[PDB]
Structure formats: C-alpha cells, structure tokens
Amino acid sequence: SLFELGKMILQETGKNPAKSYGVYGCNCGVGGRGKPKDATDRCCYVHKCCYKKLTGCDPKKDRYSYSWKDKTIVCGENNSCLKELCECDKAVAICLRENLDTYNKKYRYNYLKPFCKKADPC
Amino acid sequence: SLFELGKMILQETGKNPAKSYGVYGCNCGVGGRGKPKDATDRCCYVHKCCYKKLTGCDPKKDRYSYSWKDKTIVCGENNSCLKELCECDKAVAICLRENLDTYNKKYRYNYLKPFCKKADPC
Numbered sequence: 001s002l003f004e005l006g007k008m009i010l011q012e013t014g015k016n017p018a019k020s021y022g023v024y025g026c027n028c029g030v031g032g033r034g035k036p037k038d039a040t041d042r043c044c045y046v047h048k049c050c051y052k053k054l055t056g057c058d059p060k061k062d063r064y065s066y067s068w069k070d071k072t073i074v075c076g077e078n079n080s081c082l083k084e085l086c087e088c089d090k091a092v093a094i095c096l097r098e099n100l101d102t103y104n105k106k107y108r109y110n111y112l113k114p115f116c117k118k119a120d121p122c
Numbered sequence: 123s124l125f126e127l128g129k130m131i132l133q134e135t136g137k138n139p140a141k142s143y144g145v146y147g148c149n150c151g152v153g154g155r156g157k158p159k160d161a162t163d164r165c166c167y168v169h170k171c172c173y174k175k176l177t178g179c180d181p182k183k184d185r186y187s188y189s190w191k192d193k194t195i196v197c198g199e200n201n202s203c204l205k206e207l208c209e210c211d212k213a214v215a216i217c218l219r220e221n222l223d224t225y226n227k228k229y230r231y232n233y234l235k236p237f238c239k240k241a242d243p244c
C-alpha cells in the first residue's frame with residue numbers, strides 16, 4: 001500500500017517521501033504518468049508501469065509484508081500479486097535513492113501535472 | 123479533480139496545498155478518514171464524506187470549471203456531479219482557511235494515518 005511504499009522511499013532516500021515525491025515532476029506521486037522531467041521522474045514512470053502488470057491486488061490500498069535486513073528492503077513472504085507489488089515498490093525506492101544526485105527541488109511541487117505531455121506506453 | 127482542489131486550497135489559504143495538507147492528520151490528503159485530530163483535520167473529514175456521496179464523475183480525476191470572482195471561488199454550472207464536486211472542493215478550501223488559526227505543523231506528515239481510530243460513518 002501507500003504506507004509500505006512511503007516507508008520504503010524514506011528508508012532508501014532518507015527523505016520525507018510525500019514531501020520530496022508526492023507531486024514531483026510528471027510521474028511521481030499523485031496523478032498518472034507523463035513525459036519524464038529527469039531521472040527521478042523516470043523512476044516514478046517505471047514504477048507506475050510496473051503497477052500495470054499487477055492483477056489480483058490493489059497497489060494503493062493493499063498492505064504487504066517486508067523487512068529491513070542488512071539495510072536492504074526484503075520483500076516478504078506474501079502472495080504472488082503482493083510480492084510483485086512489493087518488488088515494484090522496492091525498485092522505485094532504490095531508483096529514487098540512486099537519483100538523489102539529480103533531484104531538483106524546482107520539480108517538487110508540480111501542480112502543472114495535468115499539462116505534462118502524454119506518456120508513451122509502458 | 124486534484125488540480126482544481128489544490129488550486130482552491132492555495133487561493134483560500136495561501137499555502138502550498140500538498141505541503142500543508144497532503145498528509146495532515148487522520149483525514150487530510152492521502153488515505154481515508156479517521157478520528158479527526160483537530161478543526162483542520164475535521165474540514166478534510168467533511169470533504170472526504172462530501173466526495174463519498176458524489177455520483178456521475180470521479181472526484182480526483184475529473185476537471186471542472188470555476189472562476190475567481192472578487193476573490194471568491196465561483197463554481198461553474200458544469201454538470202450535476204462536477205458542480206457538486208466543485209462545491210465540495212470550495213467548501214474544504216474555505217474550511218481550511220477558516221482553521222489556519224489552529225493548524226498544527228506536528229500533524230503535517232502523519233505517516234501513521236492507517237493507525238488512526240476508525241472514523242464514524244459519513
């Protein structure tokens with residue numbers, strides 16, 4: 001769910017996840033995808049595409065189990081859809097962390113999301 | 123949609139809407155309803171209940187028309203659902219402004235939303 005996702009992003013990036021990513025760029029946070037603004041935005045683009053392969057569970061509301069082992073997100077023993085969900089979430093938290101070097105605060109609150117250029121198919 | 127809603131909140135409160143209200147209390151922003159933490163939180167509770175009873179349009183996704191007339195939000199006639207939605211948003215934006223006087227920063231990023239006491243039925 002959003003809870004696990006946020007917790008993962010905090011754990012990987014060290015950053016308040018709604019603050020940094022809730023409305024970032026054309027792909028991070030609320031809304032759908034769009035032409036990505038930068039690498040961070042692409043992480044989110046990839047994450048939303050990842051969600052589309054999911055059937056059987058709801059990425060926003062379904063909670064799942066994971067742990068923190070040797071500073072690594074470890075997706076739990078769940079079920080098939082929840083496992084892949086957890087893996088989508090882990091992957092975006094890692095990607096966001098890896099692209100902290102180019103995170104741009106000026107994209108943090110993109111209230112112009114509805115006007116982002118249409119995303120290409122996943 | 124979220125676009126109109128965030129814009130009204132900014133126009134009414136003067137505050138970055140996702141920043142102040144995206145994760146506030148047990149009721150504002152992401153997630154569902156819960157026992158309100160304060161007056162600001164209560165505004166969002168009422169807003170979420172307002173959303174509950176709409177039919178015909180999607181409150182988070184569906185754009186609508188409104189105007190800023192003498193610093194008043196004036197909902198366009200739109201259609202039945204979009205107008206009701208517009209009035210839902212207008213109401214919460216006004217409510218949030220009216221309660222800035224007790225807004226509490228300590229509630230701004232409640233990552234423990236899922237553990238709020240269950241909200242009463244709308």
Ligand SMILES: CCCCCCCCCCCCCC(=O)O
Nearest residue numbers: 003006018021028029047233235
């Ligand atoms: C209490 C519920 C937790 C709320 C935390 C929300 C933080 C998630 C925002 C980060 C966006 C993730 C990337 C994406 O949009 O796919």
Ligand SMILES: CCCCCCCCCCCCCC(=O)O
Nearest residue numbers: 113124125128143150151166169
């Ligand atoms: C692209 C537009 C993004 C706007 C995101 C922020 C929208 C408002 C957040 C707070 C909503 C308060 C009312 C409620 O929670 O029901």
